[PDB]
Amino acid sequence: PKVILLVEDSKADSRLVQEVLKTSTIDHELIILRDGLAAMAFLQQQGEYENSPRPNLILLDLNLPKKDGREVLAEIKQNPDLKRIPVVVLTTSHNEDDVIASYELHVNCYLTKSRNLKDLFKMVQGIESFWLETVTLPA
Amino acid sequence: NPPKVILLVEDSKADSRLVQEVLKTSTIDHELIILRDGLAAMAFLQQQGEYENSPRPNLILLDLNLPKKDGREVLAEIKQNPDLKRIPVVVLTTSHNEDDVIASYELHVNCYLTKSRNLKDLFKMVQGIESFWLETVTLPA
Ligand SMILES: [Mn+2]
Protein backbone atom coordinates (compact mmCIF):
# COMPACT_ATOMS: atom_id res chain seq x y z
CA PRO A 1 0.00 0.00 0.00
CA LYS A 2 1.05 3.56 -0.84
CA VAL A 3 2.34 5.51 2.16
CA ILE A 4 1.00 9.05 2.14
CA LEU A 5 2.62 11.65 4.34
CA LEU A 6 0.67 14.75 5.27
CA VAL A 7 2.30 17.59 7.13
CA GLU A 8 -0.55 19.77 8.36
CA ASP A 9 -0.94 21.69 11.63
CA SER A 10 -4.60 22.48 10.97
CA LYS A 11 -6.77 19.75 12.47
CA ALA A 12 -9.86 20.80 10.52
CA ASP A 13 -7.86 20.46 7.31
CA SER A 14 -6.11 17.18 8.12
CA ARG A 15 -9.51 15.85 9.20
CA LEU A 16 -10.93 16.64 5.77
CA VAL A 17 -7.89 14.99 4.11
CA GLN A 18 -8.41 11.84 6.22
CA GLU A 19 -12.10 11.83 5.27
CA VAL A 20 -11.38 12.06 1.54
CA LEU A 21 -8.75 9.30 1.67
CA LYS A 22 -10.96 7.22 3.99
CA THR A 23 -13.28 6.41 1.09
CA SER A 24 -10.58 5.67 -1.50
CA THR A 25 -10.68 2.37 -3.41
CA ILE A 26 -6.89 2.39 -3.62
CA ASP A 27 -5.18 0.86 -0.56
CA HIS A 28 -2.82 3.12 1.38
CA GLU A 29 -1.58 4.33 4.75
CA LEU A 30 -1.79 7.95 5.88
CA ILE A 31 0.74 9.30 8.36
CA ILE A 32 -0.02 12.78 9.67
CA LEU A 33 2.61 15.06 11.20
CA ARG A 34 1.97 18.58 12.59
CA ASP A 35 5.18 20.59 12.14
CA GLY A 36 8.26 20.95 9.96
CA LEU A 37 10.59 19.42 12.53
CA ALA A 38 8.50 16.29 12.85
CA ALA A 39 8.32 16.03 9.04
CA MET A 40 12.11 16.35 8.67
CA ALA A 41 12.93 13.96 11.55
CA PHE A 42 10.53 11.49 9.92
CA LEU A 43 11.84 11.81 6.34
CA GLN A 44 15.43 11.55 7.53
CA GLN A 45 14.11 8.53 9.46
CA GLN A 46 15.91 9.68 12.64
CA GLY A 47 15.50 8.12 16.12
CA GLU A 48 12.01 9.40 16.88
CA TYR A 49 11.34 7.86 13.45
CA GLU A 50 14.32 5.57 12.58
CA ASN A 51 12.31 2.55 11.44
CA SER A 52 9.76 4.92 9.91
CA PRO A 53 8.57 4.02 6.40
CA ARG A 54 9.35 6.35 3.53
CA PRO A 55 6.34 7.99 1.78
CA ASN A 56 5.39 7.43 -1.86
CA LEU A 57 3.55 10.77 -1.88
CA ILE A 58 3.86 13.86 0.31
CA LEU A 59 1.12 16.50 0.86
CA LEU A 60 2.68 19.64 2.32
CA ASP A 61 1.44 22.99 3.61
CA LEU A 62 4.04 25.75 3.29
CA ASN A 63 3.04 27.42 6.58
CA LEU A 64 4.14 25.17 9.45
CA PRO A 65 5.12 25.69 13.11
CA LYS A 66 8.72 25.05 14.24
CA LYS A 67 10.20 24.84 10.72
CA ASP A 68 8.91 26.65 7.63
CA GLY A 69 7.29 24.43 5.01
CA ARG A 70 9.20 26.29 2.33
CA GLU A 71 12.29 24.93 4.04
CA VAL A 72 10.95 21.39 4.19
CA LEU A 73 10.21 21.42 0.48
CA ALA A 74 13.71 22.67 -0.34
CA GLU A 75 15.50 20.04 1.73
CA ILE A 76 13.28 17.23 0.38
CA LYS A 77 14.02 18.18 -3.21
CA GLN A 78 17.72 18.95 -2.66
CA ASN A 79 18.20 15.55 -0.97
CA PRO A 80 19.11 12.70 -3.40
CA ASP A 81 17.30 10.13 -1.26
CA LEU A 82 14.01 12.04 -1.12
CA LYS A 83 13.92 14.25 -4.23
CA ARG A 84 12.17 11.53 -6.27
CA ILE A 85 9.11 11.43 -3.98
CA PRO A 86 6.29 13.51 -5.46
CA VAL A 87 5.42 16.44 -3.21
CA VAL A 88 2.04 18.14 -3.39
CA VAL A 89 1.91 21.58 -1.85
CA LEU A 90 -1.57 22.33 -0.46
CA THR A 91 -1.48 25.64 1.38
CA THR A 92 -3.27 28.76 2.57
CA SER A 93 -0.58 30.98 1.01
CA HIS A 94 -1.85 32.86 -2.08
CA ASN A 95 1.46 34.77 -2.37
CA GLU A 96 2.89 34.88 -5.91
CA ASP A 97 6.50 34.62 -4.73
CA ASP A 98 5.70 31.30 -3.02
CA VAL A 99 4.05 29.81 -6.11
CA ILE A 100 7.04 30.57 -8.36
CA ALA A 101 9.76 29.75 -5.82
CA SER A 102 8.08 26.39 -5.11
CA TYR A 103 7.91 25.29 -8.73
CA GLU A 104 11.49 26.45 -9.24
CA LEU A 105 12.38 24.26 -6.24
CA HIS A 106 10.77 21.40 -8.21
CA VAL A 107 7.54 20.94 -6.24
CA ASN A 108 5.31 18.60 -8.32
CA CYS A 109 2.24 20.81 -8.06
CA TYR A 110 1.00 23.68 -5.95
CA LEU A 111 -2.58 23.87 -4.67
CA THR A 112 -4.27 26.71 -2.80
CA LYS A 113 -6.76 25.87 -0.05
CA SER A 114 -10.23 27.10 -0.88
CA ARG A 115 -11.76 29.44 1.64
CA ASN A 116 -14.96 27.44 1.48
CA LEU A 117 -14.94 23.85 2.75
CA LYS A 118 -17.12 22.56 -0.10
CA ASP A 119 -14.49 23.55 -2.64
CA LEU A 120 -11.57 22.34 -0.48
CA PHE A 121 -13.26 18.95 -0.16
CA LYS A 122 -13.56 18.92 -3.96
CA MET A 123 -9.89 19.93 -4.34
CA VAL A 124 -8.76 17.17 -1.99
CA GLN A 125 -10.92 14.64 -3.84
CA GLY A 126 -9.11 15.75 -6.99
CA ILE A 127 -5.74 15.12 -5.38
CA GLU A 128 -6.86 11.64 -4.33
CA SER A 129 -8.31 10.69 -7.69
CA PHE A 130 -5.25 11.92 -9.54
CA TRP A 131 -2.26 11.11 -7.37
CA LEU A 132 -3.61 7.87 -5.89
CA GLU A 133 -5.51 6.42 -8.86
CA THR A 134 -4.17 7.77 -12.14
CA VAL A 135 -0.56 8.59 -11.29
CA THR A 136 2.03 5.84 -11.17
CA LEU A 137 3.95 6.60 -7.98
CA PRO A 138 7.68 5.87 -7.90
CA ALA A 139 9.17 2.88 -6.08
CA ASN B 1 -8.20 34.99 -18.27
CA PRO B 2 -5.50 33.91 -20.79
CA PRO B 3 -6.03 30.64 -22.71
CA LYS B 4 -4.35 27.55 -21.25
CA VAL B 5 -1.67 26.28 -23.64
CA ILE B 6 -1.11 22.56 -23.80
CA LEU B 7 1.73 20.86 -25.60
CA LEU B 8 1.04 17.28 -26.56
CA VAL B 9 4.17 15.51 -27.80
CA GLU B 10 2.81 12.21 -29.09
CA ASP B 11 3.67 10.10 -32.17
CA SER B 12 0.58 7.88 -32.14
CA LYS B 13 -2.12 9.68 -34.13
CA ALA B 14 -4.67 7.54 -32.30
CA ASP B 15 -3.60 8.42 -28.75
CA SER B 16 -3.09 11.88 -30.20
CA ARG B 17 -6.74 11.91 -31.30
CA LEU B 18 -8.14 10.57 -28.00
CA VAL B 19 -6.53 13.55 -26.29
CA GLN B 20 -8.24 15.93 -28.70
CA GLU B 21 -11.68 14.36 -28.18
CA VAL B 22 -11.27 14.45 -24.38
CA LEU B 23 -10.24 18.11 -24.36
CA LYS B 24 -12.98 18.91 -26.87
CA THR B 25 -15.61 18.51 -24.11
CA SER B 26 -13.93 20.91 -21.68
CA THR B 27 -15.25 24.33 -20.73
CA ILE B 28 -11.70 25.51 -20.09
CA ASP B 29 -10.28 28.14 -22.43
CA HIS B 30 -7.23 26.45 -23.96
CA GLU B 31 -5.08 25.75 -27.01
CA LEU B 32 -3.78 22.22 -27.65
CA ILE B 33 -0.58 22.08 -29.71
CA ILE B 34 0.35 18.59 -30.90
CA LEU B 35 3.88 17.56 -31.95
CA ARG B 36 4.95 14.20 -33.45
CA ASP B 37 8.51 13.72 -32.20
CA GLY B 38 11.17 14.78 -29.73
CA LEU B 39 13.25 16.97 -32.03
CA ALA B 40 10.15 18.95 -33.02
CA ALA B 41 9.33 19.29 -29.32
CA MET B 42 12.64 21.01 -28.41
CA ALA B 43 12.39 23.22 -31.51
CA PHE B 44 8.96 24.51 -30.54
CA LEU B 45 10.06 24.95 -26.93
CA GLN B 46 13.19 26.82 -28.00
CA GLN B 47 11.02 28.87 -30.39
CA GLN B 48 13.16 28.47 -33.49
CA GLY B 49 12.20 28.43 -37.15
CA GLU B 50 8.50 27.88 -37.83
CA TYR B 51 8.12 27.92 -34.03
CA GLU B 52 9.36 31.48 -33.61
CA ASN B 53 7.30 33.30 -30.96
CA SER B 54 5.67 29.94 -30.08
CA PRO B 55 3.23 30.24 -27.16
CA ARG B 56 4.67 29.27 -23.79
CA PRO B 57 2.91 26.05 -22.72
CA ASN B 58 1.30 25.91 -19.25
CA LEU B 59 1.31 22.11 -19.34
CA ILE B 60 3.24 19.55 -21.32
CA LEU B 61 2.01 16.01 -21.99
CA LEU B 62 5.03 13.98 -23.04
CA ASP B 63 5.15 10.50 -24.53
CA LEU B 64 8.59 8.98 -23.97
CA ASN B 65 9.08 6.54 -26.86
CA LEU B 66 9.26 9.15 -29.65
CA PRO B 67 11.19 9.29 -32.94
CA LYS B 68 14.17 11.59 -33.64
CA LYS B 69 14.65 12.41 -29.95
CA ASP B 70 13.94 10.42 -26.80
CA GLY B 71 11.15 11.82 -24.65
CA ARG B 72 13.44 11.07 -21.73
CA GLU B 73 16.06 13.43 -23.16
CA VAL B 74 13.34 16.03 -23.75
CA LEU B 75 12.33 15.83 -20.08
CA ALA B 76 15.99 15.99 -19.10
CA GLU B 77 16.67 19.19 -21.04
CA ILE B 78 13.32 20.83 -20.13
CA LYS B 79 13.95 20.48 -16.40
CA GLN B 80 17.51 21.78 -16.68
CA ASN B 81 16.49 24.82 -18.77
CA PRO B 82 16.17 27.75 -16.30
CA ASP B 83 13.54 29.14 -18.65
CA LEU B 84 11.43 25.97 -19.07
CA LYS B 85 12.15 24.37 -15.67
CA ARG B 86 8.91 25.35 -13.90
CA ILE B 87 6.49 24.29 -16.67
CA PRO B 88 4.76 21.15 -15.31
CA VAL B 89 5.55 18.04 -17.37
CA VAL B 90 3.14 15.14 -17.38
CA VAL B 91 4.73 12.03 -18.77
CA LEU B 92 2.01 10.00 -20.49
CA THR B 93 3.52 6.99 -22.17
CA THR B 94 2.99 3.32 -22.92
CA SER B 95 5.73 1.69 -20.79
CA HIS B 96 5.54 1.19 -17.01
CA ASN B 97 9.05 -0.14 -16.46
CA GLU B 98 10.19 0.56 -12.91
CA ASP B 99 13.37 1.76 -14.60
CA ASP B 100 11.66 4.36 -16.78
CA VAL B 101 9.40 5.43 -13.94
CA ILE B 102 12.24 6.04 -11.52
CA ALA B 103 14.41 7.62 -14.21
CA SER B 104 11.65 10.09 -15.13
CA TYR B 105 11.21 11.01 -11.49
CA GLU B 106 14.94 11.44 -10.91
CA LEU B 107 14.84 13.75 -13.96
CA HIS B 108 12.21 15.87 -12.17
CA VAL B 109 9.06 14.89 -14.04
CA ASN B 110 6.01 16.24 -12.18
CA CYS B 111 4.12 12.96 -12.48
CA TYR B 112 4.31 9.78 -14.54
CA LEU B 113 1.22 8.25 -16.15
CA THR B 114 1.03 4.90 -17.89
CA LYS B 115 -1.42 4.77 -20.78
CA SER B 116 -4.08 2.22 -19.81
CA ARG B 117 -4.38 -0.71 -22.20
CA ASN B 118 -8.09 -0.10 -21.83
CA LEU B 119 -9.42 2.55 -24.22
CA LYS B 120 -12.07 3.60 -21.67
CA ASP B 121 -9.81 3.87 -18.64
CA LEU B 122 -7.55 6.08 -20.75
CA PHE B 123 -10.33 8.60 -21.47
CA LYS B 124 -10.85 8.90 -17.73
CA MET B 125 -7.08 9.29 -17.29
CA VAL B 126 -6.89 12.11 -19.82
CA GLN B 127 -10.00 13.62 -18.18
CA GLY B 128 -8.16 13.67 -14.87
CA ILE B 129 -5.17 15.53 -16.31
CA GLU B 130 -7.46 18.21 -17.75
CA SER B 131 -9.42 18.38 -14.51
CA PHE B 132 -6.47 18.37 -12.08
CA TRP B 133 -3.85 20.37 -13.99
CA LEU B 134 -6.04 22.90 -15.79
CA GLU B 135 -8.73 23.56 -13.17
CA THR B 136 -7.59 22.50 -9.69
CA VAL B 137 -3.84 23.19 -9.78
CA THR B 138 -2.35 26.66 -9.29
CA LEU B 139 -0.02 26.89 -12.32
CA PRO B 140 3.08 29.09 -12.34
CA ALA B 141 3.52 32.23 -14.43
MN1 LIG C 1 5.32 6.84 -28.77
From Swiss-Prot, chain A:
The record's annotation in InterPro entries points to:
CheY-like_superfamily, Sig_transdc_resp-reg_receiver, TCS_response_regulator
Q: Does the keyword Phosphoprotein apply?
A: yes
Post-translational modification summary for this protein: Phosphorylated by Cph1.
**Taxonomy, superkingdom:** Bacteria
Work out whether the entry's keyword set contains Phosphoprotein. yes
> Pfam families annotated for this entry?
Response_reg
Q: Where does the record place the Response regulatory domain?
A: 3-128
An example GO BP is: phosphorelay signal transduction system
Keywords in alphabetical order: Phosphoprotein, Two-component regulatory system
Q: Which residues carry this modification: 4-aspartylphosphate?
A: 61
Which CDD domains does the UniProt entry name for this protein? Answer: REC_Rcp-like (cd17557)
Q: What does this protein do?
A: Forms a two-component system with Cph1 in which it acts as receiver substrate.
- Report what the protein is called: Response regulator Rcp1
Organism, scientific name: Synechocystis sp. (strain ATCC 27184 / PCC 6803 / Kazusa)
